[PDB]
Amino acid sequence: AAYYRPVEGLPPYKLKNTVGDYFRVTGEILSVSGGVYFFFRGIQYFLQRRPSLKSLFVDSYSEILFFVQSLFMLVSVVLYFSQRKEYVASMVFSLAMGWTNMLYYTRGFQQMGIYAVMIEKMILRDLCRFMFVYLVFLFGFSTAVVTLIEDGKSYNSLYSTCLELFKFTIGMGDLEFTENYDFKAVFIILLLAYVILTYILLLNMLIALMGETVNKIAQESKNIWKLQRAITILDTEKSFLKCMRKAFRSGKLLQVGFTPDGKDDYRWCFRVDEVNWTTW
Amino acid sequence: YTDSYYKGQTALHIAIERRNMTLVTLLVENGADVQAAANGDFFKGFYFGELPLSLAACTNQLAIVKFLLQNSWQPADISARDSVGNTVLHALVEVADNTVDNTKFVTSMYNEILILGAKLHPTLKLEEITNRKGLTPLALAASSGKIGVLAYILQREIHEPECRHLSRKFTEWAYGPVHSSLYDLSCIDTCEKNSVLEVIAYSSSETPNRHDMLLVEPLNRLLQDKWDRFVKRIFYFNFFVYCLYMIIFTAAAYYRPVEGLPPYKLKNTVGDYFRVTGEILSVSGGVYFFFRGIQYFLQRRPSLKSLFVDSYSEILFFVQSLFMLVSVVLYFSQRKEYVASMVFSLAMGWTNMLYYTRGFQQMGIYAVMIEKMILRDLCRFMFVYLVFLFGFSTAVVTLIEDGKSYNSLYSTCLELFKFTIGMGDLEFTENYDFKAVFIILLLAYVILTYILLLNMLIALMGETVNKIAQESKNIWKLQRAITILDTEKSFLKCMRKAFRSGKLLQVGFTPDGKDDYRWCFRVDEVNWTTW
Amino acid sequence: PTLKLEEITNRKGLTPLALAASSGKIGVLAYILQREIHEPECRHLSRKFTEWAYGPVHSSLYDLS
Ligand SMILES: CCCCCCCCCCCCC(=O)O[C@@H](COC(=O)CCC)COP(=O)(O)O[C@H]1[C@H](O)[C@@H](O)[C@@H](O)[C@@H](O)[C@@H]1O
Ligand SMILES: CCCCCCCCCCCCC(=O)O[C@@H](COC(=O)CCC)COP(=O)(O)O[C@H]1[C@H](O)[C@@H](O)[C@@H](O)[C@@H](O)[C@@H]1O
Ligand SMILES: CCCCCCCCCCCCC(=O)O[C@H](COC(=O)CCCCCC)COP(=O)(O)OCCN
Ligand SMILES: CCCCCCCCCCCCC(=O)O[C@H](COC(=O)CCCCCC)COP(=O)(O)OCCN
Ligand code: NA
Numbered sequence A: 001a002a003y004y005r006p007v008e009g010l011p012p013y014k015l016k017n018t019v020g021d022y023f024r025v026t027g028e029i030l031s032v033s034g035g036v037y038f039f040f041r042g043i044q045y046f047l048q049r050r051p052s053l054k055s056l057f058v059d060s061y062s063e064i065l066f067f068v069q070s071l072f073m074l075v076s077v078v079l080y081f082s083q084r085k086e087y088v089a090s091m092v093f094s095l096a097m098g099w100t101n102m103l104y105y106t107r108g109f110q111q112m113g114i115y116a117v118m119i120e121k122m123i124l125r126d127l128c129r130f131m132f133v134y135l136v137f138l139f140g141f142s143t144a145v146v147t148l149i150e151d152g153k154s155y156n157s158l159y160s161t162c163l164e165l166f167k168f169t170i171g172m173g174d175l176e177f178t179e180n181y182d183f184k185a186v187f188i189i190l191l192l193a194y195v196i197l198t199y200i201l202l203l204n205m206l207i208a209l210m211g212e213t214v215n216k217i218a219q220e221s222k223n224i225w226k227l228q229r230a231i232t233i234l235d236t237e238k239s240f241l242k243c244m245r246k247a248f249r250s251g252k253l254l255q256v257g258f259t260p261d262g263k264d265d266y267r268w269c270f271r272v273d274e275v276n277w278t279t280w
Numbered sequence B: 001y002t003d004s005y006y007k008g009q010t011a012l013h014i015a016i017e018r019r020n021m022t023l024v025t026l027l028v029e030n031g032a033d034v035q036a037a038a039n040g041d042f043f044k045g046f047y048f049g050e051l052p053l054s055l056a057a058c059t060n061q062l063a064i065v066k067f068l069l070q071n072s073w074q075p076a077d078i079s080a081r082d083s084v085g086n087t088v089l090h091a092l093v094e095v096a097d098n099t100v101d102n103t104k105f106v107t108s109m110y111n112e113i114l115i116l117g118a119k120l121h122p123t124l125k126l127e128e129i130t131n132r133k134g135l136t137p138l139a140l141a142a143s144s145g146k147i148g149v150l151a152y153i154l155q156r157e158i159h160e161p162e163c164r165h166l167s168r169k170f171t172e173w174a175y176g177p178v179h180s181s182l183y184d185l186s187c188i189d190t191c192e193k194n195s196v197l198e199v200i201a202y203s204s205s206e207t208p209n210r211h212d213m214l215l216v217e218p219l220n221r222l223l224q225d226k227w228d229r230f231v232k233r234i235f236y237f238n239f240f241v242y243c244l245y246m247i248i249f250t251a252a253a254y255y256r257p258v259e260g261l262p263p264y265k266l267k268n269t270v271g272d273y274f275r276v277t278g279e280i281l282s283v284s285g286g287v288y289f290f291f292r293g294i295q296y297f298l299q300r301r302p303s304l305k306s307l308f309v310d311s312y313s314e315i316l317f318f319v320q321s322l323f324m325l326v327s328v329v330l331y332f333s334q335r336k337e338y339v340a341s342m343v344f345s346l347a348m349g350w351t352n353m354l355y356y357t358r359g360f361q362q363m364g365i366y367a368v369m370i371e372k373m374i375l376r377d378l379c380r381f382m383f384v385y386l387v388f389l390f391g392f393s394t395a396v397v398t399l400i401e402d403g404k405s406y407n408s409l410y411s412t413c414l415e416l417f418k419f420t421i422g423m424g425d426l427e428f429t430e431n432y433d434f435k436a437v438f439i440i441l442l443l444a445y446v447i448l449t450y451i452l453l454l455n456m457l458i459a460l461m462g463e464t465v466n467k468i469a470q471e472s473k474n475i476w477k478l479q480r481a482i483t484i485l486d487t488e489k490s491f492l493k494c495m496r497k498a499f500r501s502g503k504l505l506q507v508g509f510t511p512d513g514k515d516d517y518r519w520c521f522r523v524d525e526v527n528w529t530t531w
Numbered sequence C: 001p002t003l004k005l006e007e008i009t010n011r012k013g014l015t016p017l018a019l020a021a022s023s024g025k026i027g028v029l030a031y032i033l034q035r036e037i038h039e040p041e042c043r044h045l046s047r048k049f050t051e052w053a054y055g056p057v058h059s060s061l062y063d064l065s
Helices: A019-049 A061-081 A087-106 A110-148 A158-169 A184-215 A218-239 B011-017 B021-029 B052-058 B062-070 B088-094 B100-120 B137-143 B147-154 B196-201 B217-254 B270-300 B312-332 B338-357 B361-399 B409-420 B435-466 B469-490 C016-022 C026-033
Strands: A254-258 A264-266 A269-275 B169-174 B178-184 B505-509 B515-517 B520-526 C048-053 C057-063
Touching (some): A019 A061, A061 A087, A087 A110, A110 A158, A110 A184, A110 B361, A110 B435, A184 B435, A254 C048, B011 B052, B021 B062, B052 B062, B052 B088, B062 B100, B100 B147, B137 B147, B169 B505, B196 B217, B196 B469, B217 B270, B217 B338, B217 B520, B338 B361, B361 B469
Antiparallel strands (some): B169 B178
């Protein structure tokens, strides 16, 4: 629905009497419906759990991400009926977030779920520290370079210089992106120092620190995945969707026979079988 | 008991299971049938071989085993076979689980029962008896991955007369530091039904210890001996022939004619004669690998899951040949799309050179590590990466709006993929409104994929390679073992080089006066203690 | 014998098992959930119970109220 959005101006767009547009508007309605669903699901989570406003930012990442996706969808609806093309700006963000939120469902598969947990850990530790230091270096050297740059007889904008210096990180730095300066030695020394500090040192250091992190979160990631699947199980059981009663266990088994009283005692037990070849 | 869950259970079975020696002796003395098999669904639960003697053996009740085997009233038939043909030794193999304590118990009980069987029936070849599947206890231990009892059996040594003939490991001589051991290789290299090497190598990939069973001393030394003897040269010759095949295929494909509508009329010129000869040889090799893949499928009968969790090289060579044959069909169908098939075969053919990295330990272990990386780390990475790539490509191409050639999902996916290879433009289009949205999307994509996910792939590869050294070595050894067995089965000249150091006289004589030749393998060792 | 001591809740509505789970007392939690007693007139207090023992095979019942 988003791919085939009409490109005329000023929404809302009058529905045309053609098959493709009927499919398009049906897809848009379903998209907004799902956005509303996730919006109210996020509200239900917030109300039923009452997060402490710190548990939101150390926990419950998936609920926040789905809720923010739905918020972008609803802002897109508001802008769409407000006659603003900026609805597209919201919609694509929701779309992007939606696909990344697909990784939520990597739980339920042990290897992919543990992998997604490791991605979470990498983002919160290694990418956080790296991005702080990297943005400090990037902004500092970008300010130095754009100060050195002197336009006239484009660059000399902090945004353009920051973008050019960022291109070094992705292996696309020109290293001669401008000549509009005096003191070419100063320009190249600044760029080389930036490259050595960020590209050669800091990015390879990020790789090394991610190796150190993954070496020591195997069991932690497995336990967190098990906890995530446990939350999935409890939420599915709580919802249960058709008045089903499959939550029960092996039955009212007569475990100990009787209490000290004459009453016979039924416990609702779960049976676990085991084998032991010593201590007969 | 007549109920299907406990069908066939008797008082003797209960007395043995309860470990009541006195009740067992009284029941046997009172006429309890020692051959009364228990066939309940529970006794399949816990399996012990559907016999009270096998029940006593499986519960570590040695006294009851001895009594039931050689009581004065009614001895139990040691060769008795259950509903599946299993004997007491098959039952002992089946209850093994390769743990330390269970392995010790199974080893002790197996040794004692075999010695007692020899003493009571010196003429009985107890271990030669197969079950209904056709497996001896050794073949069952190999088939089921019972590495503990397997290692015990293959290295079994006994030091008393009239029972040392049961052993398979025998000390030929002891000088001072130097000792010489002879391992019995009967039904290890050839058995005429199924050998231990055939069982281990051609296992169904669900066997627990298929990679580890070849580390048992005689099997490892045997496979190395076979490699050094005659298989190394044959394998290197096959590698050379495959190199010639792929060089000829590369030359023939490189110099393909560029006119339209194949087939191409042969010109009476030297270069075209060489070209068409190369094409004929390429198609011949394709047919060869096609029929070899069919032969593998028929001779193994893969379970339609073992094709895709194991035996990747056979699949790859077969698919290469399939591309070659599709290329032939399109060539004679007057379609230029044959080139599309041919290059794929060509590409696959060269990657199939990695198959021949086995036979070189470092390169073979490296290729095994490549396999593991592809199946674990590249698989997980590619799933997450493709999710991110498709999501951000859809967002970007939705944002892109042509006006006055991007705005195609393929082009945007390609541009976003270029970031992975260090060639991302980051300003590949201006055909949008909301430049902040475009650049924010691209920066988020770059941070998630290039900076985070790809470096994370490097880190996960580091963890994986750290934790698969021994597994990779064992898998390479298994691959070379499969190579050895296939070369032995083919053998190419009616040769008989698979045999061991001769019909050596290991223990001299059985309990009878007949001398016993065992086809032994000699292993020399040096020890500075236990002189 | 008539008192269900562990069913008593505190002011927060938590039983000792719920309190052990809530406060992260994994040790006492693991003890309680796997608690087994092997005498009459006290095995009713247990939660882990051995339903049967054959030879190598044993079957346990975990009370999960
Ligand atoms: C414009 C476009 C932007 C795209 C941005 C996209 C970011 C990545 C998207 C990843 C989506 C996966 C997901 O859905 O969220 C994951 C990862 O989250 C993040 O790392 C976001 C970083 C910000 C965790 O979700 P979860 O709710 O399971 O949190 C865990 C609890 O379950 C558990 O009980 C434990 O308490 C545990 O300590 C908790 O963590
Ligand atoms: C268009 C262009 C496409 C190019 C694609 C090219 C891919 C790489 C080509 C690599 C070729 C090497 C090879 O020939 O295959 C290798 C690697 O296979 C792969 O990784 C394919 C991934 C898909 C393994 O071969 P093998 O049959 O020995 O399998 C092992 C058993 O032997 C053993 O008993 C064990 O059970 C073990 O668990 C088994 O694995
Ligand atoms: C880690 C990556 C680093 C990338 C560097 C970005 C930060 C630099 C500082 C931003 C300054 C905002 C700005 O002033 O830039 C705006 C351009 O708008 C934008 O495109 C903002 C994008 C938002 C960035 C999201 C983070 C007007 O300057 P202009 O020189 O482009 O005007 C040309 C119009 N004829
Ligand atoms: C991991 C890397 C990711 C790369 C992204 C590729 C996948 C994007 C989705 C494919 C869409 C198919 C398509 O629609 O693309 C076809 C082009 O055909 C192809 O070239 C398909 C290549 C097959 C890709 C193999 C996977 C017509 O679109 P066009 O814009 O090129 O038409 C131009 C004609 N004037
Ligand atoms: Na580059």
